[PDB]
Amino acid sequence: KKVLTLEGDLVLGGLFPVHQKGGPAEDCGPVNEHRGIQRLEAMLFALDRINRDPHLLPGVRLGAHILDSCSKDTHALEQALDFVRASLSPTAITGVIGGSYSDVSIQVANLLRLFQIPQISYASTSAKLSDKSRYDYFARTVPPDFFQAKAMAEILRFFNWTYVSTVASEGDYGETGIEAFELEARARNISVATSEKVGRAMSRAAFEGVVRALLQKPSARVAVLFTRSEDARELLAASQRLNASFTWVASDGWGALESVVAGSEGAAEGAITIELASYPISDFASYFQSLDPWNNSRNPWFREFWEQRFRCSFRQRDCAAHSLRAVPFEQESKIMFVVNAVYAMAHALHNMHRALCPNTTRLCDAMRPVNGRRLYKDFVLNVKFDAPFRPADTHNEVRFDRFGDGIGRYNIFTYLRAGSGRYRYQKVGYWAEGLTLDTSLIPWA
Amino acid sequence: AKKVLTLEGDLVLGGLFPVHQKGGPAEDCGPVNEHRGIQRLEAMLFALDRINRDPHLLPGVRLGAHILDSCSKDTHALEQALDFVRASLPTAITGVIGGSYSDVSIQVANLLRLFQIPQISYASTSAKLSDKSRYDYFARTVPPDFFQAKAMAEILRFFNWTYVSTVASEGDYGETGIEAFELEARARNISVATSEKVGRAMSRAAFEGVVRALLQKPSARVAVLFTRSEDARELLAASQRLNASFTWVASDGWGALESVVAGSEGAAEGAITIELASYPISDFASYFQSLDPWNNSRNPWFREFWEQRFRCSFRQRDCAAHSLRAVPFEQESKIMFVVNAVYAMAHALHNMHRALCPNTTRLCDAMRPVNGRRLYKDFVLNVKFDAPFRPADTHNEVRFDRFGDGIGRYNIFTYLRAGSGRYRYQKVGYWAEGLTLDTSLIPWA
Numbered sequence A: 001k002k003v004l005t006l007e008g009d010l011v012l013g014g015l016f017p018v019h020q021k022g023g024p025a026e027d028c029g030p031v032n033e034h035r036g037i038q039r040l041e042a043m044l045f046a047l048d049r050i051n052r053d054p055h056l057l058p059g060v061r062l063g064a065h066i067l068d069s070c071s072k073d074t075h076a077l078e079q080a081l082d083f084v085r086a087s088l089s090p091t092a093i094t095g096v097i098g099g100s101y102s103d104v105s106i107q108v109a110n111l112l113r114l115f116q117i118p119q120i121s122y123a124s125t126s127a128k129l130s131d132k133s134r135y136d137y138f139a140r141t142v143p144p145d146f147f148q149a150k151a152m153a154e155i156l157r158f159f160n161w162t163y164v165s166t167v168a169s170e171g172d173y174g175e176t177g178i179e180a181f182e183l184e185a186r187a188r189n190i191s192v193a194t195s196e197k198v199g200r201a202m203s204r205a206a207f208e209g210v211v212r213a214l215l216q217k218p219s220a221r222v223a224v225l226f227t228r229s230e231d232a233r234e235l236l237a238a239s240q241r242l243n244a245s246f247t248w249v250a251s252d253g254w255g256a257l258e259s260v261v262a263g264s265e266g267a268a269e270g271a272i273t274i275e276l277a278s279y280p281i282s283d284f285a286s287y288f289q290s291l292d293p294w295n296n297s298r299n300p301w302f303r304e305f306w307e308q309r310f311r312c313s314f315r316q317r318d319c320a321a322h323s324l325r326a327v328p329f330e331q332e333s334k335i336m337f338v339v340n341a342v343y344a345m346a347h348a349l350h351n352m353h354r355a356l357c358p359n360t361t362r363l364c365d366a367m368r369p370v371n372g373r374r375l376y377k378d379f380v381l382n383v384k385f386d387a388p389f390r391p392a393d394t395h396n397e398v399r400f401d402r403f404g405d406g407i408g409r410y411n412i413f414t415y416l417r418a419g420s421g422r423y424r425y426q427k428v429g430y431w432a433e434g435l436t437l438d439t440s441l442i443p444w445a
Numbered sequence B: 001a002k003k004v005l006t007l008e009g010d011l012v013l014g015g016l017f018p019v020h021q022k023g024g025p026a027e028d029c030g031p032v033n034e035h036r037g038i039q040r041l042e043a044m045l046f047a048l049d050r051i052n053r054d055p056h057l058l059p060g061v062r063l064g065a066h067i068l069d070s071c072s073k074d075t076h077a078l079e080q081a082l083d084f085v086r087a088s089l090p091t092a093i094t095g096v097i098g099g100s101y102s103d104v105s106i107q108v109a110n111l112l113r114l115f116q117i118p119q120i121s122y123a124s125t126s127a128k129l130s131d132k133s134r135y136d137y138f139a140r141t142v143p144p145d146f147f148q149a150k151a152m153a154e155i156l157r158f159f160n161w162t163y164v165s166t167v168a169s170e171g172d173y174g175e176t177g178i179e180a181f182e183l184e185a186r187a188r189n190i191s192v193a194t195s196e197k198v199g200r201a202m203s204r205a206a207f208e209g210v211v212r213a214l215l216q217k218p219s220a221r222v223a224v225l226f227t228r229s230e231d232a233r234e235l236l237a238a239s240q241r242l243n244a245s246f247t248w249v250a251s252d253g254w255g256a257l258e259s260v261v262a263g264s265e266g267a268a269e270g271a272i273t274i275e276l277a278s279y280p281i282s283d284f285a286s287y288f289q290s291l292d293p294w295n296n297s298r299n300p301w302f303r304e305f306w307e308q309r310f311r312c313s314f315r316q317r318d319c320a321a322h323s324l325r326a327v328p329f330e331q332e333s334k335i336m337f338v339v340n341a342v343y344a345m346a347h348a349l350h351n352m353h354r355a356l357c358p359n360t361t362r363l364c365d366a367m368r369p370v371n372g373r374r375l376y377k378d379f380v381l382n383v384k385f386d387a388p389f390r391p392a393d394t395h396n397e398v399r400f401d402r403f404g405d406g407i408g409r410y411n412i413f414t415y416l417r418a419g420s421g422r423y424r425y426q427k428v429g430y431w432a433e434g435l436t437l438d439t440s441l442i443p444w445a
């Protein structure tokens, strides 16, 4: 029901999974701290900096119209009507920063393309989206899963793991993710034992059956997963439950999330996981940690996040005690992707403005209204700038390929039992046009 | 701009037919589709006319039309289907009849759902459409593909074909059809040698590539297909080209179509093919054959079809010289289902009128506008009536399960070389809650 709106000369639409998927009865579930709130605030942070950037649209203010998908594609669409309501007779949406889940980005793309509205995803990695015959107004700051699968299979060949199995979740991402793995596997002389399917509706018993099924072919110790966080979580819990031992090789969904493993550490010990290569942003941590319910009114959902986060109630008046500065900050992995995606849309508009409004620094009649086709084809796809807030070590550019995709850069991790019974994720290498490993950091190596 | 076919009435029904084929790699619409387009489109117009003369079906409420051309492309159909939702925010569409190809019905249903517009498909069989959590306003006069996939597995079993290969066309029809197939197969102790995918833009070399992949497993002489017509056609050609022999077991996409086997009669000989169980509708052939370019001004694609069918031009007064009665009439396999969908929607509107408009025969206040949620849940799903223009003997009735699905009734054919030398299809079986076969009619049996 709620929308986040910010004034500006040009309004960018946003789309985030602020809430999780609801019950069979309800549309929306509880608040998403990391993939919801933190990702939405990275958008707000980025627009704030952009609006204080002298070399980036100094005469044009970037406004916002941010929607909640509730982690369900059909819901994302009901909301997404806002972006197009004016045209079908918000006054004007210049472009959409959004889609977390591939299924959401695909659904929203199918509508946005009917209105020539450009779209940039910060998280969607299904290979389908690379097709400009169907998703001709879609671009992403992340690479497709074509390269993730290619990396996963390359790890197996290096470790001489010829017999292995697969799990994967219902949805565009997982299903189309594991086929890409199996294809790259077969090309490397890698056999598949069993190929399993997992849903969210699936209960404790059904997850145990998957683990049971993976044992039927015991010559395959290594399990390859292209699953959602909560599916990886469950399958890992089911493993500790009936004391099962697998060599997990898992996709970005699990990545280096402590939540996926928390509680089922023993079973997880030794897993090799993929996280799309990114870096933290120190300015964003400071920004997020300084947010409070009385000073962050512009976020319609922040008070709900706060009650949930600090098990308090504003009615009860027990929320003021708490503070984000006094708790351990853990930035979400794809925050870089959210900032990059916001900056990419801003660079595109600046570049469009340079070309269409030569005399004035302000929004001229040529960009009233902005032509989406022209914007996407000639400006979005042709941006080339140094990624903001990047470390001194890496020199990353924000650029789109022919298919609107990002560069196939991934970080490889291992989960290990560290000192004094603590468990942690360690960076063992990276995949950027070939595998790169340091097995010294790998315990079982 | 593209034309539309509109007819006035009190209540207006949407129509969606593949009038044209997919255009080239750079054009949206291709040549005219005589059978799946023009004939199916005319069949909806025939049903409307008959209903509008019917004194027991909406005697006071006239049914109008807004028929759109899909051009056999989901992206094109969606551009067009916007005409269906503008009045909801200016013609108000009370319900839609349409979607031939599953991709199209799914895409359109995503949009239609947002505005509460009921959709009755006459040809889309993907099981994906049976999901009410996302296609809550969709129903169809055809059965879902769980039945046809089961029917296939039962054909294998009957002939003891326990080592087979599968081929699916990329999409919601092919991929979900084979998924279901493979499960039904597994349960019957039938193993799958290899499973192949036929892409969206395949070359002749790509098609050969597929055949070579099937030739890698020499024991599997059975090739089970869930393919589009042109894919089945193209697979046979490659099979002919490589002197490759297979026992094909195929879905309604190949059906009893001569389009598919023309040129590759030898490669196709001995195949087992499915076609949904239908009968030819009586008065439609006579209706269709009595159509000419001057009396049929209501169809905006009829002149184009005339010029294509009779290889003539109105620009050179060439065409008049002809008639559809001089030439043979072959009723497109799914005409029945098109007529049945129109009536299902008319009966649903009739029964809703009886309930909400007790006193009058005209549209009362309660149905201005028609509440789509009410219409679908209370009337569309509860229709039960004798099938229109059913053979004088038959007792067939139009109804839907509680999820909008039709009931699994199939005709099984064998492609044989007749005594007279010529190649033809022959009915040898039926599937309705179990398999029935006449092996005497199958030459290799």
Ligand SMILES: N[C@@]1(C(=O)O)C[C@@H](Sc2nc[nH]n2)[C@H]2[C@H](C(=O)O)[C@H]21
Pocket (backbone or CB within 6 Å): A035, A100, A101, A102, A103, A123, A124, A125, A126, A173, A227, A228, A229, A230, A252, A253, A254, A334
């Ligand atoms: N790459 C993604 C995609 O859906 O394409 C996969 C899913 S993984 C997930 N599903 C539920 N929780 N986590 C999500 C990831 C992200 O939002 O970081 C996107």
Ligand SMILES: N[C@@]1(C(=O)O)C[C@@H](Sc2nc[nH]n2)[C@H]2[C@H](C(=O)O)[C@H]21
Pocket (backbone or CB within 6 Å): B036, B100, B101, B102, B103, B123, B124, B125, B126, B173, B227, B228, B229, B230, B252, B253, B334
């Ligand atoms: N049952 C269908 C579905 O797509 O669900 C399968 C496809 S087969 C086809 N024929 C030509 N191109 N593709 C189409 C059939 C029909 O409209 O007769 C629907």
Ligand SMILES: *[C@@H]1O[C@H](CO)[C@@H](O)[C@H](O)[C@H]1NC(C)=O
Pocket (backbone or CB within 6 Å): B158, B159, B160
């Ligand atoms: C299939 O196998 C069974 C078991 O031997 C046999 O009785 C049956 O006749 C076979 N059917 C055909 C058509 O070969």
